[PDB]
Structures are given as structure tokens and as C-alpha cells.
Amino acid sequence: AKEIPEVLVDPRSRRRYVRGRFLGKGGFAKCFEISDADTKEVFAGKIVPKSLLLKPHQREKMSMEISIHRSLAHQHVVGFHGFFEDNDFVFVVLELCRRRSLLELHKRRKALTEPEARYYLRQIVLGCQYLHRNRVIHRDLKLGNLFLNEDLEVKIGDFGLATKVEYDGERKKVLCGTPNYIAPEVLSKKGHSFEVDVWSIGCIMYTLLVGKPPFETSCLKETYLRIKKNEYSIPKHINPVAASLIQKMLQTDPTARPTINELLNDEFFTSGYIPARLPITCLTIPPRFSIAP
Amino acid sequence: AKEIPEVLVDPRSRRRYVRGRFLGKGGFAKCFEISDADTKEVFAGKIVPKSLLLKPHQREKMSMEISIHRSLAHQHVVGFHGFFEDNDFVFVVLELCRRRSLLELHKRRKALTEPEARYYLRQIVLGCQYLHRNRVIHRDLKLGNLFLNEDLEVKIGDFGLATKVEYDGERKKVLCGTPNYIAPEVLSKKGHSFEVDVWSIGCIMYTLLVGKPPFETSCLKETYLRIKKNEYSIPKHINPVAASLIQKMLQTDPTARPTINELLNDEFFTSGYIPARLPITCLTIPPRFSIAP
Ligand SMILES: CC[C@@H]1C(=O)N(C)c2cnc(Nc3ccc(C(=O)N[C@H]4CC[C@H](N5CCN(CC6CC6)CC5)CC4)cc3OC)nc2N1C(C)C
Ligand SMILES: CC[C@@H]1C(=O)N(C)c2cnc(Nc3ccc(C(=O)N[C@H]4CC[C@H](N5CCN(CC6CC6)CC5)CC4)cc3OC)nc2N1C(C)C
Ligand SMILES: [Zn+2]
Ligand SMILES: [Zn+2]
């Protein structure tokens, strides 16, 4: 094997990070809490060994992820605080999100209450508005990529499938990777762009409100077939205003969906209660939003 | 971890296999030479731990592979000699192919001579004729799945993506897995059948004669795009009769390709030299097929 160092030094910034506890691993990366030995402030470190970056294509994907993410700064995007490397590893320094992601929330709570769905969906949309106006398509928005800080604020992360739109009307023809909430224009390989992320948000909203994803089966290719056929249903207990907005977003024709900028003007948002914040108990117990002191 | 036993007992057949040397691993399986303690004859054992078969879908794929393969017996198909299980593992007993596969040959020889290509391609086609007349589509014919015994005879193996055609004109809509030489009707998800294997044979013939696969790029999705666009070329040094047959097989429209039964009647075969066998040196040195004693 090749061992990961206990202290990480960036020679340009002159900065040292002590490697703390293990956060998880996925794709090519192992992740740890890392504290700046000097400033003592804590980060999420993503460490990827160069032994798995032997092919130029895999290196280029890494370089792109970093290039896209380093140029982003927004309240609902994961803060990018630096990156550096030695002969064995690439280290990326990211904003630590102490409440993990909406994945862990969903596992614990299943369907959320409408106001909670509204609260998270608004921050997800705001994050994505920022992306899209800077010509970035995320292309893998999912529960696992929507991180939550201490105050239950959403931070969009994992730009491993993101791409920049370089000219007006550019249709991306290729997507290297397998998103979760994957849009029909991708699956048929007919060309794709910004609308891909609105599709994913539609899936996310369905999941948050219903407690299961709209095209789930026990087989991935069977699911892609459902998505091709637009074969989902919205349970009757879902409110019509929410159901309508889901249906607008989850449409086969990309050009028929709303754009990211329209969404917060939908009646789902403008005529429903949007809490200003959620108490920490919302990780565990459904909130009833009492008017009581 | 969970340790694999040194001796494998099948309680129905009453048979014991001593576990010999490690052959390799891929997907979910570790593979070893295994000798029948009684008869002393040697097999290839594919051992897959049940800890990776926790989902019904993954178990069903295994059951299907076995069901398809156990019902097959042909000179150019890998012999199926049994299967059994304990609480921790499934064990499959297969014909040992001491010369590994055409993958290892290709790595060592690159482009083969025309007569060699003819020799292997004929056995590949014969194996596939057998499959197709028993309504089996292999769906992942590639160099790595075309094993060679001591006498350099081809044995088609890995039925992990195979499917049975249950009625006339059935179009398979789904393929769980990622073939190497993947046909355009699969990639676009428009429905597919027997023609898928002829496409793969076209790719195999290209590879055997040219020394590289027809749609290779440094990115898998980029390759799928080439295949969508039928974007390959045949080098000028390839003989026109071979080039013509490749082009007939490597066509976007499935219904425009030859069927497996037509192939051996192609001029590529009927008007070229087909050696009756190849000497062992053909693993390493190009043969010149001298008429000299
Ligand atoms: C860095 C990349 C990405 C990203 O881009 N950003 C921006 C990001 C930001 N912030 C975080 N935070 C946390 C992530 C995770 C945790 C955790 O508790 N992890 C635990 C998960 C279960 C593990 N257990 C399972 C049961 N095992 C026992 C066996 C019997 C069952 C023993 C081992 C132990 C570790 C805490 C966090 O915060 C304190 N993660 C991020 N990630 C990734 C980690 C997905
Ligand atoms: C069973 C499933 C499938 C199947 O369905 N059928 C029907 C089948 C039939 N027959 C075989 N035969 C053989 C397969 C393989 C070998 C070999 O030499 N393997 C070696 C490969 C390199 C490994 N090395 C690499 C360098 N490492 C050192 C480091 C520094 C580089 C050390 C470890 C050591 C083992 C020999 C065979 O025959 C004697 N395999 C089959 N397979 C699979 C194995 C693909
Ligand atoms: Zn599947
Ligand atoms: Zn790629």
C-alpha cells in the first residue's frame, strides 16, 4: 500500500493541516476532517491517491472538477478553500458540513413536511441559480451531494460531473459518469444542457415529499427504461400545487421544463409557508411549526 | 473477512475438489484451479461470496447465468461441469482453458495474420451459431471471453450478460451490465436481439486483423458516441474481402447486418486459407504457414 500522511503541507500557501477523523470514501477518494494547525479551523479534506490517476482522462476529470469548484463562491455552494498535492496524493480542502447531507436526513425521516421541502428546495434552487448564471451545469444533483451545515443550510457539492457551457446553445453530447437522477436526454444520448439540473431537482422534490424516488426499481437499466417512458406516478395525498410543479420539472421534453430562474416564482413557493430556519430537532422529529411561544 | 475453504464439497454429487492455484478475479468472483480429489481431473472454479449477493437482483443474475450455461454443450463453448453452494459461497465448476483467452494473445501479438484471424473467427462463429439456434444471445462477446484450450481451440465463456429469447421477434429492452463491443441499438436503448452478437464479432474481427478495436478513445462515453455515429475506419492495408465483411457486420442498422448463419459462407472464409490447427508457437511468433516439411 501507500500510506496517507498525518500532516498535510501546502508549500505555496505555507499551510499545514493536521489530519483528523475519517469521514468516508467514494469513487477514488478517502475523506477526513482536517484542521489548520495554525488557525485551528476545521475542514473537510478529500484525499485521492495518484496511483488511481494513472490515465490522463482520470487526471483531466479531477483538474476540471477543481477548476469549476475553485471559481465558485455562494451561500448554498460548498466553499472551496484550496488544493495541493505531493508525489502520491491530491488534497482538496472543502467546507466541513457537520450535518452531512440530505441523504442521511431522508434515511432518517423519509417524506418531509411541505414547509421543510419548501425550505430545502429554495436553497437548492438558489444554489443552482448561481451555478447556471455562471454557465455551470452540475449534472449530478442528488440527496448525497446536498450537504447541510450546523444551521441546516444546504451546500451543493461534488462537482465531479459538472461541465462549463462555453457558448450559447452548446449541447453537451457526453457525460462521463452515472448520475442518480439522470435526465432522459442523457440516457438516449441526444444532447443536453442546463435543463438536466432542473430534472434532478424535480426528482429531489418528489423524493423529499413522497419519501421515495420517482423511478425506483430493483434494476438500474429498468429504471432508465421507466425514465425513457416517463413512467412515474404522484400519490393522491400530495397537494396539487406541489404535484403540478413536480410534473412541470419531470418532463421528457427538456425544452418543456421550467428554467431554474422561474422556479421560486411558482405557486408552490409563493403561496406556502417557508420557514426562515429549521430547529436541529428536524433531523429527527417532524416539526409542526406551532405558533405557540 | 470470510475465508474460502481449501476443499469444496458438493453433497448431491458427493464430489470433493481440492482448491489449487489462483487464476484471477473480476466482478464478484475469485477464481482458482480446482482438482477433483478422486478423479484428479482439473477444472476452473469460479467462487463468489454470498456477502456480495445480498440483493435479489444480483442473485437472479447469477441464477440466470448458471441456468443458461448449464444447458449448453458445444465444442466451442466453455464446458459447464457443475455448481453448488454453502452458506457463504457459490461455486461454479468450469472447463479449464490452459491458454487463457484471446485477450492475452492480442496483448502479445497485436494484429494476427489473415489465416489466424480466419481460424479463430470460424470457431467463434460456430460457437455463436450454436448459441443462436438455441435462442441464446451472449451479449458480451469479447477477447477476454473467448478462451483457448491447450490445442488453441476457442471456448466461449462468461454468460453473465446472456439472455434467452422466449418468443419469435422478442426485442430485449434492457441490458444490465456494460459490454465491451457494445452495439448501437443497445446504446440508444431502442431494443435489441441476436444481431448484437454479430456486431461484437465484427469488432473482434477488426481487432484481430488491425490490432486495435474500431471505436477506441480515451473515454468510454466518447467511444459510445463514435459507435452511435458509426465513426470508424479500416486501414488500407486490410484486404478488401476482409474489409467488406467487417463493414457488413459493423453497421448501425441491426437488420442490415448478416445473420450468424450466413457468415462462414462469406468469401473471407470460402476463398482464403483456413489452417486446420495452429502450432503452440502462434501464441508468440507469427506463423508463415510454409509448405516446407
Ligand atoms: C469531503 C467530500 C464530501 C464533500 O464534498 N463535502 C463538501 C463534505 C463536507 N462535509 C462533510 N461532513 C461529514 C461527512 C461524514 C461524517 C460522518 O459522520 N461519517 C461516518 C460515516 C459512517 C462510518 N462508519 C459506518 C459503520 N461502521 C461500522 C460497521 C458495522 C457497520 C464504521 C464506519 C464512519 C464515518 C461527518 C461529517 O461531518 C462532521 N462531508 C463531505 N463529503 C463526504 C464525506 C461525502
Ligand atoms: C473461471 C472464469 C473464467 C472462465 O469462465 N473460464 C471458463 C476460464 C477457463 N480457464 C481459465 N484459465 C486460466 C486463467 C488464468 C490463468 C493465469 O495464469 N492467471 C494469472 C494472471 C496474473 C496474476 N498475477 C499478475 C502479476 N502480479 C504481480 C504484480 C507486480 C505485477 C501477481 C499476480 C496471477 C494469475 C491461467 C489459466 O489457465 C491455466 N480461466 C477462466 N476464467 C477466468 C480466470 C478469467
Ligand atoms: Zn440491473
Ligand atoms: Zn470518460
CATH number of the domain encompassing residue B195: 1.10.510.10
Q: Which of B5, B13, B27, B31 is nearest to B96 (CA)?
A: B31
Residue ranges with strand state E in B27-141: 29-36, 42-49, 80-85, 89-95, 136-137
Q: Which of B169, B183, B105 is nearest to B141 (CA)?
A: B183
Residue B33, strand partner residues: B44
Question: Could you say which of B68, B100, B132 is where a domain stops?
Answer: B100
Compute the C-alpha angle A113/A129/B221, nearest 5°. Answer: 100
Same domain, A95 and A66: yes
Here the cell at position A29 is 477518494
Conformational region of residue B47, where left means phi above 0, alpha means psi within -120 to 50, and beta covers everything else: beta
Interface of B with A (CB under 8 A): 55-57, 173-176, 187-189, 218-222, 224-225, 228
Task: Say yes or no: CB of residue A157 within 6 Å of ligand 1.
Answer: yes
Structural domain of B27: 12-100
In a domain, B292, yes or no: no
Closest CA–CA distance from residue B192 to any residue of chain A (Å): 14
Same domain, A124 and A158: yes
Chain B residues near residue A176 by CB distance under 8 angstroms: 219-222
Pocket test for ligand 1, best of A30, A76, A97 (most atoms within 8 A of CB): A97
Task: Say yes or no: CB of residue A158 within 6 Å of ligand 1.
Answer: yes
Q: Kindly list the catalytic residues of B.
A: 140
Q: Which amino acid is located at A36 in the chain? A: D
Burial of A73 from C-beta contacts in 10 A (0-12 / 13-18 / 19+): exposed
What CATH number should be reported for the domain holding residue B84? 3.30.200.20
Q: Which amino acid is located at B226 in the chain? A: R
Same domain, B96 and B110: no
> SS3 breakdown of chain A: % helix, strand, coil, rounded to 5?
35, 20, 45
In a domain, A111, yes or no: yes
Same domain, A158 and A237: yes
Q: Can you list the alpha helix ranges (DSSP code H) found in chain A?
A: 56-70, 102-109, 114-133, 184-187, 195-210, 220-229, 240-249, 267-270
Q: Which of B246, B252, B231, B249 is nearest to B184 (CA)?
A: B252
Burial of A257 from C-beta contacts in 10 A (0-12 / 13-18 / 19+): buried
Contact between B179 and B199 (Cβ < 8 Å): no
Using the structure block, give the residue that is written with the C-alpha cell 459462407: B265
Classify A192 as helix, strand or coil: strand
In a domain, B6, yes or no: no
Closest CA–CA distance from residue B188 to any residue of chain A (Å): 5
Q: How far is CA A187 from the centre of its chain?
A: 20
Residue A158 CA, ligand 1 centroid: distance in Å: 14
CA dihedral sign, ordered A91, A93, A97, A101 = negative
Domain count, chain A: 2
Q: Which of A215, A211, A233 is nearest to A116 (CA)?
A: A211
Same domain, B87 and B105: no
Yes or no, beta carbons of B218 and A57 under 8 Å apart: yes
Burial of A95 from C-beta contacts in 10 A (0-12 / 13-18 / 19+): middle
Q: Kindly list the catalytic residues of A.
A: 140
Which strand (E) or helix (H) includes residue B62? helix B56-70
Q: How many residues does chain B have?
A: 293
Same domain, A120 and A263: yes
Compute the C-alpha angle A62/A65/A70, nearest 5°. Answer: 120
Yes or no, beta carbons of B219 and A56 under 8 Å apart: no
Task: Say yes or no: CB of residue B46 within 6 Å of ligand 2.
Answer: yes
Q: Which amino acid is located at A45 in the chain? A: G
Same domain, B86 and B107: no
Q: Give me the half-sphere count of Cα atoms (radius 13 Å) on the Cβ side of residue B210.
A: 19
Same domain, A105 and A217: yes
Q: How many residues does chain A have?
A: 293
Same domain, B190 and B118: yes
Whole-number Å distance between alpha carbons of B255 and B90: 39
Same domain, B113 and B56: no
Chain A residues near residue B220 by CB distance under 8 angstroms: 176
Index of the ligand 1 atom closest to the CA of residue A26? 45
Question: Could you say which of A100, A130, A163 is where a domain stops?
Answer: A100
Whole-number Å distance between alpha carbons of B16 and B36: 6
Question: Could you say which of B64, B81, B100 is where a domain stops?
Answer: B100
Yes or no, beta carbons of A174 and B56 under 8 Å apart: no
Whole-number Å distance between alpha carbons of A248 and A235: 16
Nominal resolution (angstroms): 2.5
Residue ranges with strand state E in B69-132: 80-85, 89-95
Q: Give me the half-sphere count of Cα atoms (radius 13 Å) on the Cβ side of residue B91.
A: 27
Classify A61 as helix, strand or coil: helix
Same domain, B90 and B109: no
Same domain, A170 and A112: yes
The partner residue sitting opposite A218, judged by closest CB among B56, B218, B225, is B56
In a domain, B88, yes or no: yes
In a domain, B289, yes or no: no
In a domain, A172, yes or no: yes
Closest CA–CA distance from residue B247 to any residue of chain A (Å): 24
Contact between B25 and B33 (Cβ < 8 Å): no
Q: Which amino acid is located at B266 in the chain? A: D
Residue B180 CA, ligand 4 centroid: distance in Å: 14
Here the cell at position A151 is 444551521
**Contacts for A153 with CB less than 8 Å, ≥ 6 apart:** A75, A76, A123
What experiment produced this structure? X-ray
Residue A236 CA, ligand 4 centroid: distance in Å: 41
Whole-number Å distance between alpha carbons of A82 and A11: 12
For the stretch B208-212, contacts whose Cβ atoms lie closer than 8 Å and that sit 24 or more positions apart, written own/partner, are B208/B102, B208/B106, B208/B111, B208/B112, B208/B116, B208/B117, B208/B120, B208/B121, B209/B111, B209/B112, B209/B114, B209/B117, B209/B238, B209/B242, B209/B246, B210/B111, B210/B234, B210/B235, B210/B238, B211/B106, B211/B110, B211/B111, B212/B110
In a domain, A176, yes or no: yes
Whole-number Å distance between alpha carbons of A180 and B275: 51
Contact between A157 and A94 (Cβ < 8 Å): yes
In a domain, A281, yes or no: no
Whole-number Å distance between alpha carbons of A274 and B114: 72
Measuring CA to CA, how many Å separate B110 from each of A106, A110, A283, B107? 52, 55, 59, 6
